[PDB]
Design a binder for these strands. Structure first.
Lengths: 191, 306, 114, 114
RNA sequence: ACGAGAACAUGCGCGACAUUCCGAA
């Protein structure tokens, strides 16, 4: 049993909105800064991996299964991605708030009447420190699972994350600080 | 799922509304230079305190409640020209058709303060083109464009004659290429389908409304000035104020005459003051720059490249 | 705190011709912008930039007063500009919070009465 | 009394003209946050900090009334706005806890009759 | 020179497994 800890930065390219103004973005209460919930990330990668509870057996072991009579622990433990300290200091260098407001006219074609609405998005350029843990139960399946992790992250870098991304929301870019084995003897450089 | 790069060619000024309108007190404007200098809040106030004119400005506000131009205040105090430019955000060229300007509409800006065009503007314009689940159709916000391209333009109404409007809007100048990233699913929508649909949408819009504009003598003057670019393929109207008939399901889903009488009917219900009192269907409904060549507001062209 | 009696007297159903949901909003969005700035600072006393943003806050107050006389009558009745002068002198976060909670009070009571 | 008001405004199920626990979650989250503040302090009288925060609860009561019409009808019929006044008048923990029990009994019967 | 006198209701045990605040403009 080994633990390999993927620490990195998810830099947001567009207006990112995860709304838990029509919908304010979710915020960590302690610092009142915007936050990307780890469940938002994990759900998005799991859905995109499944597309690309009844899922493929590879996906079931990767993100967890709750099937009756056969329960598999989630090999992936996506944690909340908090607002980066470096990005927050970068924002403070300007007279810039961490969250912008986006407006939409929402015109109905039948009546030619537009209903205004507001969406609170984390401004473009914000960075979040993402924490990812992979649990090693089968040693021989780590390389295959990490390939599918790359597939999930690649899909995320092409897709959106939270909010209505079909209109240019929540687009992200993933950079990785280091993928090192925090507990156990597993080789980090292979992954 | 395939990724297409999208390029927008700004053949006409585009102004997306951000809900922010600023009056003349929030930005300098030189009538002789026809130039507007955008002024932010705190920088103007802190400089005013340093020069000691904060009391004088408040007195100027009290003397004239109806209108207290910032430029006239700078002229009467004879402050240094570079002092005026110290608190300036940026410089934008003004294209007035009227002389001063009453209001100034702001082009949408992100948090960082640069000009960008939202993916919801393209999503809304593209949807009206197709109409006549959209979950596959995914767009992304454009990369920021240079601030120099932003300039103030004036709305012009053409009802058998050219008529300037007191309203001003911030629009991107012509000769601009902005980039998008669009992801599509080969099942629901195809690249060939969307480009063909846009071309048909512009054509039906052209022969149902724009030709009616040309027939009137006011349209002829607009044409002779170059208002309609000779390039006009795929044509869209992203900016607001580009016209009610543009990007409508009425023209595509109804005959030319039936859609026009429905447009007149809905216009008279919404605008009872003017359209409502009209008792006849017009021959063309609705009846409604520093550079020498005139431009039509909102005119733009897409191009999708795999 | 005292906003309820203020908005009750100023109410004319709408508060006034100029105190609609959009004309007032412009003021409370500047109040919002400063409110987040003080919220994120997490300091006992307001910073110089906080005061600089407060300086424009009453400048915008007279800006809207000149544009719309209805805003001027509301501002002079609330003495809200006076509280803007009052908060700078004390120069403390809790005082700014009380002023902005009062700021949320006028708008909340205005919505409640309409 | 809590069972009476819920009974009277229970309509066929539409309660308080369309009030759900999601509409009240903003108000009650503040009310039980205030409850933990009063619960922890061993004082026969409400704290000064609690009193100012309860005043903000009164402001939020009007703000939610203006936003959601169902919540507005809920507050007026209950007099929970008036009950937040008398607890500040008496300024005692025991009266306030009776008010929190009243609001808890209110949403309890509200869920019971749905 | 008390039906007395001695005697731990005690040991092991995650409130846990899957779950995009999301589609539409």
């Amino acid at each position: 049993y080994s633990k390999i800890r993927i620490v990195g930065k998810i830099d947001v390219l567009t207006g990112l909105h995860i709304g838990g103004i029509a919908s304010p973005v979710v915020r960590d209460p302690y610092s009142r800064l915007p936050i990307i919930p780890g469940s938002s990330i994990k759900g998005k990668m799991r859905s995109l991996l499944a597309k690309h509870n009844q899922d493929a057996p590879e996906i079931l072991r990767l993100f967890g299964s709750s099937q009756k009579g056969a329960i598999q622990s989630s090999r992936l433990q996506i944690s909340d991605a908090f607002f980066s300290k470096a990005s927050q200091e970068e924002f403070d260098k300007k007279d810039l708030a961490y969250t912008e407001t986006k407006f939409e006219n929402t015109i109905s074609r039948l009546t030619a009447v537009a209903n205004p609405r507001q969406i609170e998005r984390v401004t473009r350029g914000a960075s979040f420190d993402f924490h990812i843990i992979y649990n090693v139960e089968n040693i021989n399946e780590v390389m295959a699972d990490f390939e599918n992790i790359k597939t999930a992250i690649h899909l995320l870098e092409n897709d959106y994350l939270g909010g209505g991304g079909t209109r240019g929301n929540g687009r992200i870019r993933f950079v990785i600080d280091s993928i090192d084995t925090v507990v156990g003897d597993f080789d980090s450089s292979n992954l | 799922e395939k990724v297409y790069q999208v390029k927008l060619k700004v053949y006409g000024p585009v102004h997306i509304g951000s809900g922010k309108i600023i009056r003349k007190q929030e930005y300098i404007y030189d009538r002789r230079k026809s130039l507007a200098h955008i002024v932010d809040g705190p920088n103007l106030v802190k400089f005013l305190n340093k020069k000691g004119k904060f009391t004088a400005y408040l007195q100027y506000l009290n003397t004239t409640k109806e209108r207290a131009d910032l430029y006239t205040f700078l002229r009467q105090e004879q402050i240094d020209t570079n002092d005026w430019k110290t608190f300036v955000l940026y410089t934008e060229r003004v294209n007035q058709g009227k002389k001063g300007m009453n209001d100034l509409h702001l082009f949408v800006r992100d948090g960082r303060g640069d000009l960008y065009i939202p993916g919801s503007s393209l999503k809304g314009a593209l949807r009206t083109v197709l109409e006549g689940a959209f979950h596959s159709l995914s767009i992304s916000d454009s990369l920021p464009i240079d601030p120099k391209n932003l300039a103030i333009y004036q709305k012009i109404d053409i009802n058998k004659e050219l008529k300037p409007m007191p309203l001003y809007r911030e629009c991107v100048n012509v000769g601009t290429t902005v980039e998008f990233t669009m992801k599509i699913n080969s099942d629901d929508w195809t690249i060939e389908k969307i480009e063909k649909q846009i071309q048909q949408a512009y054509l039906q819009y052209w022969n149902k409304w724009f030709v009616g504009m040309v027939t009137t003598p006011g349209g002829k003057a607009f044409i002779k000035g170059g208002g309609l670019p000779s390039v006009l393929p795929t044509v869209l109207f992203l900016g607001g104020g580009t016209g009610f008939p543009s990007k409508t399901t009425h023209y595509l889903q109804k005959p030319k005459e039936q859609a026009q009488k429905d447009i007149f009917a809905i216009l008279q219900r919404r605008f009872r003051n003017v359209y409502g009192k009209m008792a006849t269907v017009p021959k063309n409904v609705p009846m409604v720059d520093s550079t020498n060549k005139w431009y039509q507001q909102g005119v733009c062209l897409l191009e999708f490249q795999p | 705190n005292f906003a309820r009696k203020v908005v009750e007297e100023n109410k004319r159903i709408v508060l006034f011709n100029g105190l609609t949901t959009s004309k007032l909003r412009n003021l409370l969005e500047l109040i919002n912008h400063v409110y987040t700035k003080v919220y994120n600072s997490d300091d006992t006393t307001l910073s110089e930039d906080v005061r600089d943003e407060l300086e424009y806050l009453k400048v915008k107050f007279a800006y809207e007063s000149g544009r719309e006389p209805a805003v001027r009558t509301f501002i002079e009745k609330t003495y809200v500009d006076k509280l803007v002068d009052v908060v700078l002198k004390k120069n403390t976060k809790k005082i700014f919070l009380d002023y902005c909670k009062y700021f949320e009070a006028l708008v909340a009571y205005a919505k409640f009465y309409r």
